[PDB]
Design goal:
Pfam family, one (chains A, B): RVP
Bound molecules: ligand K2E
Number of domains of chain A: 1
Number of helices of chain A: 1
Oligomer: homodimer
Distance between the termini of chain A: 15 Å
Strand content of chain A: over 45%
Number of strands of chain A: 9
Membrane topology (chains A, B): Lipid-anchor
Keywords (chains A, B): Aspartyl protease, Host endosome, Hydrolase, Protease
Largest interface: A-B, 40 and 40 residues
Helix content of chain A: under 10%
Shape of chain A: globular
Largest sheet of chain A: 7 strands, mixed
InterPro entries (chains A, B): Aspartic_peptidase_AS (IPR001969), Peptidase_A2_cat (IPR001995), Peptidase_aspartic_dom_sf (IPR021109), Retropepsin-like_cat_dom (IPR034170), Retropepsins (IPR018061)
Order of helices and strands of chain A: EEEEEEEEHE
GO cellular component, one term (chains A, B): host multivesicular body
Chain lengths: 99, 99
């Protein structure tokens, strides 16, 4: 689809067998989700945003379905203000910016 | 043009007589620029992201040229680590997400 930006580009995602809403975020290198239970092993990591740095749980090679498009990649879980889909998965679903 | 997301979607902008590199950021409601001394009246604002909030100065009706496309709107200025073009101006240059 072609998504205009007069509203927040929010979409439904499926991860760990659960539906969630997430923001397509071209300014994010990485995908960061709010606190949730995810299966598999994880490593502690730090990530920085506009206001500072936070501790996150890094899950590798996780399936997320983004508006029916499959991606398998790294998902960070921690105290982000919003579920964000970052470029690491946006590229997997073939997302581009156009103007 | 079409911008893939393999790398950060950085583009050249023109603001207040200065050329800068800025992120085309679909996850940003507002446009936030690195500290710079603009003339005119402003209002204090707080904007939140990963790591917490930063204090910024809100300037209204500021003209920004984004890869040759002119836009005019609200621009926030503060201690951000990156110049961020938000949705308030992305809509004005006809920027869409596509996948
Ligand atoms: C509330 C949803 C997002 C944060 C979750 C909002 N951000 C825009 C993101 O694109 C920032 C934009 C950003 C980019 C680099 C540095 C600081 C901010 N990216 C970001 O935080 O990404 C982080 C996760 O991947 C990593 O790669 C970049 C930082 C990490 S933000 O920079 O904090 C931002 C911008 C304009 C705004 C605002 C918040 O509130 C209203 O107006």
């Amino acid at each position: 689809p072609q998504i205009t930006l007069w509203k927040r580009p929010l979409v439904t995602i499926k991860i760990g067998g659960q539906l969630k809403e997430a923001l397509l975020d071209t300014g994010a290198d990485d995908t960061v989700l709010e606190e949730m239970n995810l299966p598999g092993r994880w490593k502690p990591k730090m990530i920085g945003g506009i206001g500072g740095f936070i501790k996150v749980r890094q899950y590798d090679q996780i399936l997320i379905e983004i508006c029916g498009h499959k991606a398998i990649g790294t998902v960070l879980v921690g105290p982000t203000p919003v579920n964000i889909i970052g470029r690491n998965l946006l590229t997997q679903i073939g997302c581009t910016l156009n103007f």
